[PDB]
Swiss-Prot record:
It comes from the Eukaryota. This is Neutrophil defensin 1. The modification ADP-ribosylarginine is found at residues 14, 24. The modification Phosphotyrosine is found at residue 21. The chain holds residues 65 to 94 of 94 of the full protein. Transmembrane segments: none annotated. Disulfide bonds join 2-30, 4-19, 9-29. The gene is DEFA1.
Amino acid sequence: ACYCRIPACIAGERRYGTCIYQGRLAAFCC
């Protein structure tokens, strides 16, 4: 699974992109 995360991806994940979810930016992490 992947996750839109704030403030960053968690250890064991890598950032593959970005999400926008209600005026807020997120890291896309898998």
